[PDB]
Amino acid sequence: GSMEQGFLPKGWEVRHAPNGRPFFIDHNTKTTTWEDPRLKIPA
C-alpha cells in the first residue's frame, strides 16, 4: 500500500553512508542532517 511510500515526512529520505549509518535528507529545503525523524515524528 502506502506504508512503503512514506516512511519519513514528505520530502524526507533516508540514505546510508559508507560507515553504515543512515542520514536523512530533506528534499524540500535541501537540508541534510544526522537525526532520526522516526523517533520524533509520530506518523
Domains parsed from the chain with CATH numbers: 8-43 (2.20.70.10)
* b/e code 2-11 from CB counts within 10 Å (16+ = b): eeeeeebeee
* Experimental determination approach used: NMR
CA separation for the pair 9, 32 (Å, rounded) = 14
CA nearest to 33, candidates 18, 5, 19, 12 = 12
Cell matching residue 21? 549509518
Strand partners, 14: 24
H helices present in the chain, as ranges? none
- Do 37 and 9 contact (CB within 8 A), yes or no? yes
Coil, helix or strand at residue 23: strand
What are the Cα distances from residue 43, in Å, to 1, 21, 29, 38?
A: 15, 22, 20, 8
CA nearest to 13, candidates 2, 3, 30 = 30
